[PDB]
């Protein structure tokens, strides 16, 4: 079967032919859509097929399909799988692993960089102390004094599903959001919830605008454990505008690492709760949602008085012209402080290029048009004119339950 | 299959339950969703008009009624006879209505109840048909208090005499290839304007020159005919803060009235139906002017503003956007033509939608083309989930009739 797709700007037509290798479901059928909806323990019957479909992509990659080597691993894990009822990954299929999941990963518009990643096997963790190193070493690494690399930390698979090693932070460096008895929030107010649970296992809130969460690392099933990231590992950007003086007034900043840690790896049907990545920042994700979401700081009421903007109607375009000033701020603050980050014409200008070439040699490229489109601006970036399939293809990164939902306490 | 749907900036969570009457496909599977693709008998046509008449007279409190049974037998009774049937203009009325109501693409639906419906059904002649669009025009118009009116030409019957008007849209730019390889006008139109000429349109060849209309009746040959020129009510474009903006010579017409889709009602087809509202802003100073294959002003603009255009990192193209955004509201509010901002727009859509589940069980609504072009998420609608899923009464995409025409 071929698919055509369109782009509606240049009338450049591709064909996908990769679709042919999905697997998992949409959430769509022929009489629903559901392409704007955000959201959606294993037998040895559902695992070997799961393993030889991945051993044989990882085979044909490095032109070995049918090789001896192929079928002797293909072998091992058959047996390794009867006599334990799971498998380990050798570490080349793991980094293999990694990195195909992002590529697949349909929701990221930072694909093209997805053969560049770097991968720390911490497989070999056991305790909340442990993976507390590892992260540490993943935060420097990444960071590199800010010139940022892409990494991934990979912490034990899944056994039982009752001895889980999981990161309870939706992502490693965030900060914390207190409600008031007068209903306000004082510092980021989607972290809430998290920040209620990280001051009931006993941290100490500064309760500040811009306070860094501690960690809340779980191993092995067992109860997680707070830890402080070291000060001197969380790079932070002060914001400022080239023009406006009075922005750095403000009193915002941001980190500048964005690391996803509470979503689950699957390679090769091997489940992997606990791996935490990170890359650098497309502006908008500060500027934008960050900063201009209503449910978040919510700060274009005062950077538009700031600006002295007509404000009485929506019709003079107040919170769209705010909305560029402080997107500009961000962009300008990292660069000026030789902090990795992305605009978002960069970077959805190579994501096109990146999604052409991964039809030309993959036959497609599974991509979710709702993410993929920035925040502001759309149409004045080439992925709005940019017809996209989504489809999900494995290794491939999941969302999970969130732990404390879950979780059985030991006590 | 019964569906909740989550607002993220809120946490409301609505309960979809009209899916269910859903009929036509999404072209989505359960493998891959192509919810960001723009085009994904006798027999026949009983089940549609029945389809049709139970909701019609469920809508009306008289669902089981002896009227309702008497409708269908004679709806039956003349599809068996005569392998069609007509209409009551109770029926058409509803059914126009409800087809903009199930318009899942369209963000100004809070409106769907108050539609000016013309039928033009006894309309015989491309004369005619050029008689109705004008009085469309004008009473749309209104010197710029817009009223939303439909125009309905006569059903389609054997599929040889339809009725099509050629124009996609009433009212738009002819564009013209110049010999320097450019493009003079509006890009988006060079193929039609070239068909009006080959019918012997004589083009003025300028930036802004409204479109004749092409007029097809009853499967004969479209005939040409100009929409007076006091009727297009346009506004020149001025900003409220740069005195320079005026200069660039931009304008644009006031009344969006597209022309090219099928109107669905009870398995009928109306393939001549054009349809008008008032504008969004962003439609013109977002996309008729900055799409790069339209008219594509970005650089000029901001050479005016004097912005530092050598890095895509000091967002100039996004100030420069703004700023032709606000020159167009403002340009329509001085004038007093009806105009939308995509904030009030998409706030309205979310209290519209609101009011659907509420009252109806849902609002099939395609989040792609909902949420504008511009400030994505700083609108509502960005933060809403929404299901898509094709109810009938609609409109219709068709095949472009150059395409079709046995000449
Ligand atoms: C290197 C530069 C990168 C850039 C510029 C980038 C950009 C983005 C952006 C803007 C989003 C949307 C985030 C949101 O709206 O919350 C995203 C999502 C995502 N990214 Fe990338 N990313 C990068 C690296 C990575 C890496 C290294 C991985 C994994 C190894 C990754 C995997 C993902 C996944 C799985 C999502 C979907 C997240 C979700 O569903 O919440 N990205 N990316
Ligand atoms: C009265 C104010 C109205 C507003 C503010 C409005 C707004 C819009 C906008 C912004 C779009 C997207 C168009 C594009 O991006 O090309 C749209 C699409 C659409 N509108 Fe509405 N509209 C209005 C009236 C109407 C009326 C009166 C009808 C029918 C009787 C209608 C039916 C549709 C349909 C079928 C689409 C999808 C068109 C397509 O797929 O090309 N609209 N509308
Ligand atoms: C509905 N989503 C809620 C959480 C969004 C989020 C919060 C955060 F602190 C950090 C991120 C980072 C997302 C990301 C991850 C990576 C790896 C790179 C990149 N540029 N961006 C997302
Ligand atoms: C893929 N799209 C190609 C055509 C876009 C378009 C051009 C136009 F002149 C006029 C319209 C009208 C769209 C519209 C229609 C109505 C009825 C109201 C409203 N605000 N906007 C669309
Ligand atoms: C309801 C809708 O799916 C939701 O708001 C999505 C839209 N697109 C998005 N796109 C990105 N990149 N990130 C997001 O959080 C969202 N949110
Ligand atoms: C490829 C993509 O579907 C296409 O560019 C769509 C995106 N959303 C849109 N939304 C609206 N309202 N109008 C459009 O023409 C489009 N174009
Ligand atoms: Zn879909």
Not at 381 to 401: A, D, G, I, K, W
Request: net charge neutral; hydrophobic share 35%; proline share 5%.
């Amino acid at each position: 079967r071929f698919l055509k797709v369109k782009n509606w700007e240049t009338d450049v037509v591709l064909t996908d032919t990769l679709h042919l290798k999905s697997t998992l479901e949409t959430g769509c059928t022929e009489h629903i859509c559901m392409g704007s909806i955000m959201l959606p323990v294993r037998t040895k019957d559902q695992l070997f097929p799961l393993a030889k479909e991945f051993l044989d992509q990882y085979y044909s990659s490095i032109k070995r399909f049918g090789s001896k080597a192929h079928m002797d691993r293909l072998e091992e894990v058959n047996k390794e799988i009867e006599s334990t009822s799971t498998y380990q990954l050798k570490d080349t299929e793991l980094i293999y692993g990694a990195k195909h999941a992002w590529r697949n990963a349909s929701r990221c518009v930072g694909r093209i960089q997805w053969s560049k990643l770097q991968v720390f096997d911490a497989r070999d963790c056991t305790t909340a102390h442990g993976m507390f190193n590892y992260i540490c070493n993943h935060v420097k690494y990444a960071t590199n004094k800010g010139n940022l690399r892409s990494a991934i930390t990979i912490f034990p698979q899944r056994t039982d599903g009752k001895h889980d090693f999981r990161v309870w932070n939706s992502q490693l460096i965030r900060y914390a959001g207190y409600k008031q008895p007068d209903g306000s929030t004082l510092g980021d107010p989607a972290n809430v919830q998290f920040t209620e649970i990280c001051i009931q296992q006993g941290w100490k809130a500064p309760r500040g605008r811009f306070d860094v969460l501690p960690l809340l690392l779980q191993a092995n099933g067992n109860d997680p454990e707070l830890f402080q990231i070291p000060p001197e590992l969380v790079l932070e950007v002060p914001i400022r505008h080239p023009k406006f003086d009075w922005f750095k007034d403000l009193g915002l900043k941001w980190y500048g690492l964005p690391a996803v840690s509470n979503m689950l790896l699957e390679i090769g049907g091997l489940e992997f709760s606990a791996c935490p990545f990170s890359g650098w920042y497309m502006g908008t994700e500060i500027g934008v949602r960050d900063y201009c979401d209503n449910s978040r700081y919510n700060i274009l009421e005062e950077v538009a008085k700031k600006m002295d903007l007509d404000m009485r109607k929506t019709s003079s375009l107040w919170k769209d012209q705010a909305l560029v000033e402080i997107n500009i701020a961000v962009l300008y603050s990292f660069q000026s402080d030789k902090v990795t980050i992305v605009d978002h014409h960069s970077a959805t200008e190579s994501f096109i290029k990146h999604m052409e070439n991964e039809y030309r040699c993959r036959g497609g490229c599974p991509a979710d048009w709702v993410w993929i489109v920035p925040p502001m601006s759309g149409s004045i970036t080439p992925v709005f004119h940019q017809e996209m399939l989504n489809y999900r293809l494995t290794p491939s990164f999941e969302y999970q339950p969130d732990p404390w939902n879950t979780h059985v306490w030991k006590g």
